[PDB]
Write an enzyme that holds these catalytic residues in place. Structure first.
Site, PDB file in Angstrom:
ATOM      1  N   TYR A  16      32.876  43.559  26.846  1.00  0.00           N
ATOM      2  CA  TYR A  16      32.657  44.465  25.725  1.00  0.00           C
ATOM      3  C   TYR A  16      32.420  43.781  24.390  1.00  0.00           C
ATOM      4  CZ  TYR A  16      33.293  48.663  28.520  1.00  0.00           C
ATOM      5  OH  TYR A  16      33.135  49.678  29.445  1.00  0.00           O
ATOM      6  N   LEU A 121      40.373  41.846  23.286  1.00  0.00           N
ATOM      7  CA  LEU A 121      41.033  40.869  24.133  1.00  0.00           C
ATOM      8  C   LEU A 121      42.251  41.496  24.795  1.00  0.00           C
ATOM      9  CD1 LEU A 121      43.814  39.561  22.490  1.00  0.00           C
ATOM     10  CD2 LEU A 121      41.955  38.700  20.999  1.00  0.00           C
ATOM     11  N   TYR A 172      42.476  51.463  27.500  1.00  0.00           N
ATOM     12  CA  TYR A 172      42.114  51.983  28.812  1.00  0.00           C
ATOM     13  C   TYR A 172      43.071  53.117  29.173  1.00  0.00           C
ATOM     14  CZ  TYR A 172      40.967  52.148  33.773  1.00  0.00           C
ATOM     15  OH  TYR A 172      40.598  52.560  35.015  1.00  0.00           O
ATOM     16  N   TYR A 182      46.247  48.716  37.914  1.00  0.00           N
ATOM     17  CA  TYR A 182      46.381  48.215  36.558  1.00  0.00           C
ATOM     18  C   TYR A 182      47.808  47.764  36.333  1.00  0.00           C
ATOM     19  CZ  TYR A 182      44.520  48.065  31.777  1.00  0.00           C
ATOM     20  OH  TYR A 182      44.071  47.688  30.548  1.00  0.00           O
ATOM     21  N   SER A 222      33.472  42.805  33.947  1.00  0.00           N
ATOM     22  CA  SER A 222      33.623  41.715  33.014  1.00  0.00           C
ATOM     23  C   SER A 222      34.404  40.613  33.702  1.00  0.00           C
ATOM     24  CB  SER A 222      34.435  42.208  31.827  1.00  0.00           C
ATOM     25  OG  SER A 222      35.784  42.433  32.216  1.00  0.00           O
TER      26      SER A 222
HETATM   27  N1  NAD Z   1      36.093  45.742  31.232  1.00  0.00           N
HETATM   28  C1  NAD Z   1      36.638  46.941  31.417  1.00  0.00           C
HETATM   29  O1  NAD Z   1      36.460  47.587  32.439  1.00  0.00           O
HETATM   30  C2  NAD Z   1      37.498  47.526  30.336  1.00  0.00           C
HETATM   31  C3  NAD Z   1      37.867  48.989  30.412  1.00  0.00           C
HETATM   32  C4  NAD Z   1      38.703  49.399  29.292  1.00  0.00           C
HETATM   33  C5  NAD Z   1      39.082  48.503  28.301  1.00  0.00           C
HETATM   34  N2  NAD Z   1      38.709  47.218  28.305  1.00  0.00           N
HETATM   35  C6  NAD Z   1      39.174  46.363  27.210  1.00  0.00           C
HETATM   36  O2  NAD Z   1      38.094  45.720  26.525  1.00  0.00           O
HETATM   37  C7  NAD Z   1      38.535  44.449  26.036  1.00  0.00           C
HETATM   38  C8  NAD Z   1      37.500  43.371  26.335  1.00  0.00           C
HETATM   39  O3  NAD Z   1      37.721  42.843  27.638  1.00  0.00           O
HETATM   40  P1  NAD Z   1      36.530  42.829  28.720  1.00  0.00           P
HETATM   41  O4  NAD Z   1      36.771  43.957  29.695  1.00  0.00           O
HETATM   42  O5  NAD Z   1      35.224  42.746  27.963  1.00  0.00           O
HETATM   43  O6  NAD Z   1      36.751  41.440  29.491  1.00  0.00           O
HETATM   44  P2  NAD Z   1      36.438  40.027  28.787  1.00  0.00           P
HETATM   45  O7  NAD Z   1      37.032  38.947  29.662  1.00  0.00           O
HETATM   46  O8  NAD Z   1      34.968  39.988  28.427  1.00  0.00           O
HETATM   47  O9  NAD Z   1      37.289  40.097  27.418  1.00  0.00           O
HETATM   48  C9  NAD Z   1      38.626  39.605  27.356  1.00  0.00           C
HETATM   49  C10 NAD Z   1      38.650  38.374  26.456  1.00  0.00           C
HETATM   50  O10 NAD Z   1      39.947  38.169  25.881  1.00  0.00           O
HETATM   51  C11 NAD Z   1      40.118  36.759  25.700  1.00  0.00           C
HETATM   52  N3  NAD Z   1      41.540  36.343  25.652  1.00  0.00           N
HETATM   53  C12 NAD Z   1      42.419  36.309  26.671  1.00  0.00           C
HETATM   54  N4  NAD Z   1      43.609  35.857  26.210  1.00  0.00           N
HETATM   55  C13 NAD Z   1      43.462  35.605  24.891  1.00  0.00           C
HETATM   56  C14 NAD Z   1      44.365  35.102  23.826  1.00  0.00           C
HETATM   57  N5  NAD Z   1      45.653  34.785  24.090  1.00  0.00           N
HETATM   58  N6  NAD Z   1      43.858  34.970  22.579  1.00  0.00           N
HETATM   59  C15 NAD Z   1      42.574  35.289  22.329  1.00  0.00           C
HETATM   60  N7  NAD Z   1      41.747  35.745  23.286  1.00  0.00           N
HETATM   61  C16 NAD Z   1      42.160  35.909  24.553  1.00  0.00           C
HETATM   62  C17 NAD Z   1      39.402  36.115  26.873  1.00  0.00           C
HETATM   63  O11 NAD Z   1      38.848  34.848  26.506  1.00  0.00           O
HETATM   64  C18 NAD Z   1      38.300  37.097  27.212  1.00  0.00           C
HETATM   65  O12 NAD Z   1      37.055  36.568  26.747  1.00  0.00           O
HETATM   66  C19 NAD Z   1      39.867  44.153  26.708  1.00  0.00           C
HETATM   67  O13 NAD Z   1      40.910  44.244  25.737  1.00  0.00           O
HETATM   68  C20 NAD Z   1      40.048  45.245  27.740  1.00  0.00           C
HETATM   69  O14 NAD Z   1      41.414  45.658  27.834  1.00  0.00           O
HETATM   70  C21 NAD Z   1      37.944  46.725  29.285  1.00  0.00           C
HETATM   71  O1  FT1 Z   2      38.528  48.984  34.902  1.00  0.00           O
HETATM   72  C1  FT1 Z   2      39.395  49.008  34.040  1.00  0.00           C
HETATM   73  C2  FT1 Z   2      39.674  47.813  33.203  1.00  0.00           C
HETATM   74  C3  FT1 Z   2      39.164  46.558  33.548  1.00  0.00           C
HETATM   75  C4  FT1 Z   2      39.427  45.457  32.735  1.00  0.00           C
HETATM   76  C5  FT1 Z   2      40.217  45.614  31.572  1.00  0.00           C
HETATM   77  O2  FT1 Z   2      40.502  44.519  30.782  1.00  0.00           O
HETATM   78  C6  FT1 Z   2      41.547  43.686  31.150  1.00  0.00           C
HETATM   79  C7  FT1 Z   2      42.430  44.056  32.193  1.00  0.00           C
HETATM   80  C8  FT1 Z   2      43.473  43.219  32.572  1.00  0.00           C
HETATM   81  C9  FT1 Z   2      43.639  42.000  31.915  1.00  0.00           C
HETATM   82 CL1  FT1 Z   2      44.981  40.904  32.393  1.00  0.00          CL
HETATM   83  C10 FT1 Z   2      42.770  41.626  30.890  1.00  0.00           C
HETATM   84  C11 FT1 Z   2      41.722  42.470  30.515  1.00  0.00           C
HETATM   85 CL2  FT1 Z   2      40.611  41.955  29.203  1.00  0.00          CL
HETATM   86  C12 FT1 Z   2      40.740  46.864  31.247  1.00  0.00           C
HETATM   87  O3  FT1 Z   2      41.511  47.032  30.128  1.00  0.00           O
HETATM   88  C13 FT1 Z   2      40.462  47.965  32.056  1.00  0.00           C
END
Ligand code: NAD
Ligand code: FT1
Ligand code: NAD
Ligand code: NAD
Ligand code: NAD
Ligand code: FT1
Ligand code: FT1
Ligand code: FT1
Lengths: 287, 287, 287, 287
Positions: A16, A121, A172, A182, A222
């Site tokens: 994201y 993050l 989420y 989760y 991701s």
């Molecule tokens: N991907 C999904 O399905 C999804 C769904 C809902 C919410 N989200 C949220 O969106 C956000 C982006 O994550 P994503 O899904 O794009 O995966 P992503 O891996 O692209 O993003 C997570 C990032 O957080 C960084 N990170 C981890 N530990 C860290 C620390 N201690 N300090 C600084 N950075 C750190 C990692 O380097 C990683 O690049 C997350 O917070 C996630 O909870 C994701």
């Molecule tokens: O499909 C739902 C979904 C997938 C990925 C997500 O992000 C994370 C989920 C767990 C951990 Cl350890 C770290 C991250 Cl960035 C998230 O928030 C929701």
């Protein structure tokens, strides 16, 4: 005049954070990437090696304008907080000024006051265990890295932000409804995050006229999502099958909403969890 | 046959734990008190000295039947988890088997399987600071003591519980709506608690046929409530002035609901936040 | 290119309809006004005389592009629904094609398919009575005009709308939390309307790829707000004093969120109640 | 001593009304049945013949104490509301004092003030149509019979109820989350009803010291559940398979919560939607 956005949580182009960076670029926002130290050098390698060039295309005439890319670790508040073990780490030993406070100082020193902040993050070292088998250390890690880190980010960045600045983070729906895979206190971390978003909106809104909101995104394949044991494929297959909008959810879908929330266009919105998930949250059951 | 309830979080007679103990006693439930070590001896003194005798009256023919009263610290999961500083403490040095696991073992060793569990405890060492000024250590303390402690309680107690047992904890509406004085990450802890309650209901419900719910209580002038800088008096004056039910909220009001939730009468309710607050939660504004 | 928006519910320039029109006009969207017949002619005379000329001033010289202005009554689904008395009423005798179907048909004939729809209207005969005192007839009046009307607009306008089109309505927080003064069953209608927004997001998303959401707007001193018994002065004062964001809430603050939700930028958002009230909804009590 | 409950909405023994009656009977509450005239005489003939004799078996020998059975139609507020056609309908010509006011008056005359009220009825002519396809008339039908009726029962029964009395209704989760098949505007009515429960809790709590809440019950194969197009078999199967608690949900599971909420034990709870569905509402998706 120019707007500057610090995005904390970029590791590649498949999450994201990248999506948000892209959409902000449509609006000519100068982007600064906060990149977790363990993957900073590899990101820098890929970037220099041109691996991301295709992903930086906005369109016919635009190309993502990345101001800077800095090491950032949300595990650490200030310089004093780093332990010897991380100090002595292969990946960190060669980097500096990457604690949350150091980065605010460093940005402000380099480019002055910013007006947009993105927390993108999460981390939980026991994400693969269900809540009931998560250890205290595990659970507090989820909370430290995924929830306290937003508070710290604000505490330190508000000094370097203009009035009427805006801040967003990503959540989420696991926080509000049970999603069995989760684990590790990630559901808990999100729950605290969404509540903190409110409490912060009050403080930042009253004291600094600064707004803060959170985007509850649907699933995206991701890096971190693939880490969960696959979960993410079931999640995506399910969303695409049963969401009101049967269309693939793209990171720039969250990106465009982030851009709006971060702009003066949403001057009257603060303290909210906004759902950017193809309406999946509204369903009770498979139809 | 007899039912046994372990209540974790009794320090005197002026909080919700006592209220719950009282109401369960109407139903002839054997009560075991879990008392935080720092105030265990003083509680024991007061009890032996008869200070609580009037507060133990159920009515004309009944008198609270307290099975046992044990030292209990939710800061610690097992024996291994206690640090030397607490080991070497005036108040702890003279007590033993007070970690969450030790207490489950000790109860089970003494009285066999129980069927009712009450989490009635909170703590946050920076409760007097607003969220934005709360330190990481502060915030994680709130979460450790006020939220992780429910998970640990379940992890360890389910082994010593009958099928169809029931578990409750206590929350506050600060989780869902901003309450300016509820600082130190207490709002956050409650938020995680209410979400954890869901995730746990799923696990415990599916694996053990055990139910878990949480009661969002309105204000009561308890020990911990007086600690918050007064907050609690404003809270009470406000509730009594504007709640739908303009009647003083008593701990046994929460007690009676707890009793119902802990009984087979609510066989079909799990994973819920139940509001026991004179309907105050339904109001938008002062009328 | 060629975005057309039908805005249902404008009597003057003091409403949220006006504010929505102004902000849409800023993105070069073609505006069609649906105007309740009781106020249509006084609105036209006012318009022709250039009484709204000042109000159409956007920024440095740009003026509103009102493509059409049509008499419209959300009471009536189709010509056959209109009772003989209304047909022959003084204000209605001179007007035609003002039912929901007919304005759909009309718009389509003259302009083809549109892609944006705004439901910006409410009514209730007994708004001045509290719920308990509201007659069956006045409650059903409220539901009919304020809630059914959205379902009906949808059923008929979906025919004349391109895939990926978007639909918004306006709601108030009295559906979720108690607001004395919001009577006549208007809270009931907002509740129904926020729930119908989800049900509709499902059907329209799956069968048509069309989105629908609702904005929960904060208080604004519009004509109708005054008709409520004063109530609105109190509402605005409470809001400016206690909201996280202590600024005056403008109709154009709503309009720019409406604009965003109607545009392709909100492609992944459907079924949602979006709050635009300076964050007041997040508050539990005053401070 | 001398608790009297009026249960509005019973046609047979397969409903939640029956279940509520049985559980109240267990606490020695005097039961008065309000019975819709279309099914009244077939219910009486059935009763006299002792067809319900088996169903009145409580535990080891105890049988239901039905104090009265009255024809009742929640469509009509007062005698003056009844249209000439209904008055002279075959099933109505032989009945009197069946409007809301008249049954209030009647109950009062014969028994004095009561202290418990159950709204256990819903109806909608077009339940088989989805929302988009529901006519204005059929939507208002749903609201009228399923939602207004609670407000009306309240306005009239408050007169014949002692202070500290309690009122419950039944709702379904389709008001909050999308459930295809729950059409006719029944989701709209449940939404309105859950919101009217708050507004009413305010007025009745402050002016009368009377509580009102609503139970959100899980699926049960009642007569009306079958009239919905099958839908209910699917609902029950989904529920038994995916709920935290995989047990069959019984009408008496609801009845014992109703009992609790009507008793003085729930003194501090008002305005609430209480979920009785084995925790299904907490789930996001299946597993
Ligand atoms: N991907 C999904 O399905 C999804 C769904 C809902 C919410 N989200 C949220 O969106 C956000 C982006 O994550 P994503 O899904 O794009 O995966 P992503 O891996 O692209 O993003 C997570 C990032 O957080 C960084 N990170 C981890 N530990 C860290 C620390 N201690 N300090 C600084 N950075 C750190 C990692 O380097 C990683 O690049 C997350 O917070 C996630 O909870 C994701
Ligand atoms: O499909 C739902 C979904 C997938 C990925 C997500 O992000 C994370 C989920 C767990 C951990 Cl350890 C770290 C991250 Cl960035 C998230 O928030 C929701
Ligand atoms: N009192 C209120 O106004 C109110 C309103 C809503 C919710 N609650 C909740 O009800 C619960 C009961 O608290 P209360 O209000 O009765 O005050 P209380 O002081 O009576 O109860 C809190 C108890 O928790 C114990 N405790 C603190 N740290 C502990 C630890 N590490 N391990 C074990 N026990 C520890 C303390 O000894 C204390 O007795 C709390 O969880 C509180 O959050 C209270
Ligand atoms: N004004 C506020 O503070 C506020 C706050 C929250 C929500 N809202 C919502 O905004 C909408 C109204 O906007 P407003 O507040 O500017 O009031 P307004 O009076 O400016 O707008 C309502 C308009 O709807 C029109 N209308 C009434 N009945 C109609 C019918 N049967 N058919 C067609 N048109 C009809 C009226 O002519 C009126 O101009 C309502 O849905 C209201 O619930 C308003
Ligand atoms: N059955 C379920 O699975 C379920 C799940 C959630 C909620 N509910 C709620 O429970 C209530 C109905 O109970 P049920 O499910 O046992 O169905 P039911 O048919 O057993 O009960 C409904 C009763 O209401 C009566 N009734 C209908 N219209 C009436 C009127 N105008 N005046 C007076 N009485 C009238 C009918 O005679 C019928 O006996 C409804 O409010 C429904 O929304 C039911
Ligand atoms: O009036 C609302 C209120 C008052 C007291 C409460 O309990 C605590 C609050 C803070 C801390 Cl550190 C510990 C406890 Cl037990 C609470 O949850 C809510
Ligand atoms: O202060 C909040 C507020 C003010 C006005 C509103 O609009 C109406 C309220 C009642 C009626 Cl009958 C009609 C309309 Cl357009 C509203 O919904 C909320
Ligand atoms: O499965 C859930 C379910 C089943 C039945 C229900 O009751 C009704 C539903 C529609 C109508 Cl018209 C009348 C009634 Cl009593 C209900 O509310 C929910």
């Amino acid at each position: 005049n120019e707007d500057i956005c610090f995005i904390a949580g970029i590791g590649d182009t498949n999450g994201y954070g990248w999506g948000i960076a892209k959409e902000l670029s449509k609006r000519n926002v100068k982007i600064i990437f906060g990149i977790w130290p363990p993957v900073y050098n590899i990101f820098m390698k890929n970037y220099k090696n041109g691996k991301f060039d295709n992903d930086m295309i906005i369109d016919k005439d635009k190309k993502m304008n990345i101001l800077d890319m800095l090491p950032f670790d949300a595990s650490f508040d200030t310089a004093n907080d780093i332990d010897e073990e991380t100090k002595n780490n292969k990946r960190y030993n060669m980097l500096q000024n990457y604690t949350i406070e150091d980065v605010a100082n460093l940005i402000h020193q380099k480019y002055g006051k910013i007006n947009m902040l993105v927390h993108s993050l999460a981390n939980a070292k026991e994400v693969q265990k269900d809540l009931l088998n998560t250890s205290r250390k595990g659970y507090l890690d989820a909370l430290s890295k995924s929830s306290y880190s937003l508070i710290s980010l604000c505490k330190y960045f508000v000094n370097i932000m203009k009035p009427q600045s805006s801040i967003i983070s990503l959540t989420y729906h696991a926080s509000q409804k049970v999603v069995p895979g989760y684990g590790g206190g990630m559901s808990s971390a999100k729950a605290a995050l969404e509540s903190d978003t409110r409490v912060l909106a009050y403080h930042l809104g009253r004291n600094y006229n600064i707004r803060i909101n959170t985007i509850s995104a649907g699933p995206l394949k991701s890096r971190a999502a693939t880490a969960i044991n696959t979960f993410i494929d079931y999640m995506i297959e399910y969303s695409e099958k049963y969401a009101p909008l049967r269309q693939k959810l793209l990171s720039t879908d969250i990106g465009s909403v982030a851009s709006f929330l971060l702009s003066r266009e949403s001057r009257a919105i603060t303290g909210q969890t906004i759902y950017v998930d193809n309406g999946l949250n509204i369903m009770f059951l498979p139809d």
